[PDB]
Amino acid sequence: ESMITLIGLGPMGQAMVRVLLENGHGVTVWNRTASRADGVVAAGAVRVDTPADAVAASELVLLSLTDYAAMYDILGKAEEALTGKVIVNLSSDTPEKTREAAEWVEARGAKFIAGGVMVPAALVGKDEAYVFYSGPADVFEKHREALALIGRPDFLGEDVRLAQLFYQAQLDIFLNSLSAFMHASALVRSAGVPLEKFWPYAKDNFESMGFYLEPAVEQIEKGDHPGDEADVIMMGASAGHLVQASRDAGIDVALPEAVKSHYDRAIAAGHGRSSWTSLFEIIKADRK
Amino acid sequence: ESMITLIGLGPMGQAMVRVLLENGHGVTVWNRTASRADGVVAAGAVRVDTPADAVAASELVLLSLTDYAAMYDILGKAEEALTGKVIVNLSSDTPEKTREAAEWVEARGAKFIAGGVMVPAALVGKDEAYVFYSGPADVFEKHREALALIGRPDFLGEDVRLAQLFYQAQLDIFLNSLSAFMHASALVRSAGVPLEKFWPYAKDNFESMGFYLEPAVEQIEKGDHPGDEADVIMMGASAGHLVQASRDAGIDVALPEAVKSHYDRAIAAGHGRSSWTSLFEIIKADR
Ligand SMILES: NC(=O)c1ccc[n+]([C@@H]2O[C@H](COP(=O)([O-])OP(=O)(O)OC[C@H]3O[C@@H](n4cnc5c(N)ncnc54)[C@H](OP(=O)(O)O)[C@@H]3O)[C@@H](O)[C@H]2O)c1
Ligand SMILES: NC(=O)c1ccc[n+]([C@@H]2O[C@H](COP(=O)([O-])OP(=O)(O)OC[C@H]3O[C@@H](n4cnc5c(N)ncnc54)[C@H](OP(=O)(O)O)[C@@H]3O)[C@@H](O)[C@H]2O)c1
Numbered sequence: 001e002s003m004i005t006l007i008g009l010g011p012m013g014q015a016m017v018r019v020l021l022e023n024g025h026g027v028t029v030w031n032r033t034a035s036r037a038d039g040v041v042a043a044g045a046v047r048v049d050t051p052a053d054a055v056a057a058s059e060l061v062l063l064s065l066t067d068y069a070a071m072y073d074i075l076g077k078a079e080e081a082l083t084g085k086v087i088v089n090l091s092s093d094t095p096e097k098t099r100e101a102a103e104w105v106e107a108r109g110a111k112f113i114a115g116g117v118m119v120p121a122a123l124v125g126k127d128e129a130y131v132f133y134s135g136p137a138d139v140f141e142k143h144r145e146a147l148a149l150i151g152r153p154d155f156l157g158e159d160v161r162l163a164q165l166f167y168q169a170q171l172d173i174f175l176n177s178l179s180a181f182m183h184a185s186a187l188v189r190s191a192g193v194p195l196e197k198f199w200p201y202a203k204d205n206f207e208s209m210g211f212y213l214e215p216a217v218e219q220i221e222k223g224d225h226p227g228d229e230a231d232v233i234m235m236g237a238s239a240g241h242l243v244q245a246s247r248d249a250g251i252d253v254a255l256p257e258a259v260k261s262h263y264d265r266a267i268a269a270g271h272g273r274s275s276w277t278s279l280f281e282i283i284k285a286d287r288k
Numbered sequence: 289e290s291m292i293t294l295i296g297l298g299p300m301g302q303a304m305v306r307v308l309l310e311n312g313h314g315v316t317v318w319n320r321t322a323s324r325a326d327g328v329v330a331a332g333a334v335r336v337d338t339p340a341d342a343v344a345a346s347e348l349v350l351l352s353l354t355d356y357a358a359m360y361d362i363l364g365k366a367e368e369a370l371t372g373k374v375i376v377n378l379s380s381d382t383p384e385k386t387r388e389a390a391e392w393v394e395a396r397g398a399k400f401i402a403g404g405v406m407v408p409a410a411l412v413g414k415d416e417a418y419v420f421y422s423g424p425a426d427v428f429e430k431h432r433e434a435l436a437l438i439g440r441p442d443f444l445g446e447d448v449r450l451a452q453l454f455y456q457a458q459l460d461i462f463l464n465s466l467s468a469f470m471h472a473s474a475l476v477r478s479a480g481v482p483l484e485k486f487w488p489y490a491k492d493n494f495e496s497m498g499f500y501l502e503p504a505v506e507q508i509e510k511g512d513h514p515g516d517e518a519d520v521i522m523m524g525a526s527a528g529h530l531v532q533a534s535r536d537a538g539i540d541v542a543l544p545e546a547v548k549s550h551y552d553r554a555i556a557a558g559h560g561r562s563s564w565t566s567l568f569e570i571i572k573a574d575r
Binding site (some may be wrong): 011066094095096097120121161166168170171172173175176179180181182183184185186187188189190191193194195196198199201202203205206207208210212213216217220221228229230233234235237238241244245248249250254255257258259261277279280282283284286 | 385468487498537
C-alpha cells in the first residue's frame with residue numbers, strides 16, 4: 001500500500017516503521033547511522049543512501065528526530081526534493097522554532113504538520129497511544145488514516161505551534177515527576193532506607209494527585225486563592241524544610257530550591273495567607 | 289472520656305480536635321491566637337490560658353504547628369510540667385531538627401513521638417487518612433487506639449527521624465507536582481489556550497505516572513539504567529526545549545532550569561545513552 005518515508009530511526013522511529021509495515025504500508029527509511037536500519041530493513045523497509053532519496057520516495061515524510069536542528073541538517077541536503085511533499089515532524093522543540101520550521105518547509109513548497117507522540121516506543125500503535133497534531137487540516141485529513149496507526153490523532157488546530165505547546169506542557173509535568181520521584185528516592189536512600197519501603201507511599205501520592213488538582217483549576221481560572229485549609233506560609237516553611245533536609249542528606253538542592261523559590265516569590269507578593277494556587281500569580285507571564 | 293491535649297489550632301489541629309471529640313475523648317486546647325479555639329470550644333473542647341495548663345491537663349499532648357521552632361516557643365513556657373507527658377509532634381521540619389527536639393523533650397522527662405499526617409484537614413479521621421509515626425514503640429502502643437481516630441497509624445521504627453523523613457519525601461513529590469501543574473498551566477495560558485482545554489491531558493498524565501515509575505524502582509535499586517527506549521540525550525534536549533519555551537512565554541524558568549540541570553549533570557557523568565533513571569546517580573549523596 002502507500003509508500004511512506006520515515007527519517008530518524010531512534011526507538012520511536014523504529015516502532016512507527018514496524019507499525020506502518022505490519023499494516024501493509026511500504027516504508028522507505030534513512031538515518032544518519034545507516035546500521036540502525038538493519039532491524040527494520042529485515043522487517044520489510046527499504047534503506048536508501050541519501051536524505052534526498054528518502055524525501056523523493058514518498059508524498060508523506062515522517063521525521064522522528066531529537067530536535068528541529070536535526071531537521072535542518074537532514075532536509076538541508078534535500079531542498080529541491082521537498083516540493084509537493086507533506087512533512088509530519090514528530091520531534092520535541094520550542095513552539096517558536098516549530099513555526100519558524102513550518103515557514104522554512106513551506107517556502108521550499110511542502111506542507112508542514114507538527115506532532116507530539118504522548119507514549120513511549122513500546123506503546124506506539126497500541127490503544128493507550130495518542131499524538132497531538134497541528135497545521136493545515138485539509139492536508140492532515142488526507143493522511144489521518146495512516147497517522148492513526150501510530151496512535152489516536154488529536155488535531156488541536158491550524159496553528160502549527162499547538163501540538164508542540166501541548167507536548168511541552170505534558171513534558172513539563174512528566175520530567176518533573178521523574179526528577180521528583182528520584183529526588184524523594186535519593187532522600188530516602190540517603191538515610192539507609194531501601195526504596196521498596198517508600199515506593200508504595202510514592203505510588204499512592206502520584207495516584208491521588210488528580211484529586212488534589214481538580215478543584216485548583218477553578219481557583220487558577222478566577223485568581224481566587226483562599227488559604228483557610230492550607231496557606232503559602234505553612235507550605236513555604238515545608239519547602240524550606242525539604243531544602244535543609246536535602247543539604248543535611250548531601251543530595252541535589254537545585255530541584256527543592258526551585259520549588260522553594262515559588263513559595264518565596266509568592267510570600268514577597270503578599271500571598272502568605274493565600275492557597276498554594278496563588279503561586280500561579282508569580283509563575284504566570286505578566287498580563288503586562 | 290480520656291482527656292487529650294492538642295496545642296496548635298490551625299486547619300489540621302482543629303480537624304484533629306473535632307475527631308477526638310466526636311469519639312468521646314475530652315480535649316484541652318491552647319493556641320497563640322486564643323480566638324481560633326471558638327469553633328472547637330463550641331464543639332466540646334476546653335480552652336485554657338497557658339501552655340503549662342494545656343500540658344498539665346493530659347498524658348498525651350499533640351502539637352500541630354508550622355515548624356519545630358514553634359514547639360520551643362510554646363513548650364519553653366512549660367518545661368517543669370513536661371515530666372511524665374507524651375509529646376506527639378505532627379509538624380513539618382528537618383529530620384536532624386526532629387532528633388534534636390526529641391533529645392530536648394526527653395531531657396525534660398517526657399516521651400517524644402514524631403508524626404507526619406498524609407492527608408489535608410478535610411480528610412482527617414476518614415478512610416483515606418494515614419499518618420507516619422516514629423519513636424519509642426512501647427509509648428506509641430499505649431496511645432495507638434486514640435491516634436488511629438486521626439488516620440491509619442504507620443509505625444516506621446524507633447528512629448524518631450523516620451516519620452519526618454517519609455513526610456519530607458512525600459512532600460518532595462507533592463509540592464513538585466503542584467508547581468509543575470501550575471508551570472504547565474502557565475505555559476498553556478501564556479499562549480491564549482484556556483486551562484479547561486489542557487486539564488484532561490494533565491489529569492491523564494498524573495494518573496499514568498504510577499505505571500511509568502514502577503519499573504524504575506528496580507533500575508534505581510540496582511544502578512541499572514538501560515537507555516534503549518529513551519535516553520538522557522533525548523530527554524535532556526526536551527528539558528532544554530521546555531526551558532527555552534518558558535523564556536519565550538515569559539513564565540518561571542527556575543523549575544525547568546532545575547530539571548534541565550539533572551540532565552546536564554547526567555550527560556557530564558557520561559550517562560547520555562542511559563535511561564532517565566541514571567539521573568539518580570547525580571542526585572544521590574556521595575557513598
Ligand atoms: N523515546 C520516547 O519514549 C519518546 C516518547 C515521546 C516522544 N519522544 C520524542 O521522539 C523523538 C525521537 O526520540 P527517540 O527516543 O526515538 O530518538 P532520539 O534518541 O532522539 O534519536 C532519534 C533520531 O535522531 C537522529 N538524530 C539526532 N540528531 C541528529 C542530527 N543532527 N542529524 C541527524 N540525525 C540526528 C538519530 O540519528 P542517529 O541514529 O544517527 O543517532 C535518531 O535517528 C524526540 O524528539 C523525543 O522527544 C520520545
Ligand atoms: N494543612 C494541610 O493540608 C496539611 C497537610 C498535612 C500536614 N500538614 C502539616 O500540619 C502542620 C499544621 O499546619 P496547618 O496547615 O494546620 O496550619 P499552620 O498554618 O501551620 O498553623 C498551625 C498552628 O501553628 C501555630 N504557630 C505557628 N507558628 C507559631 C509560633 N511561632 N508560636 C506559636 N504558635 C505558632 C499557629 O498558631 P496561630 O493561630 O497563632 O498562627 C497555628 O495554630 C504543618 O506542619 C503542616 O505541614 C498540613
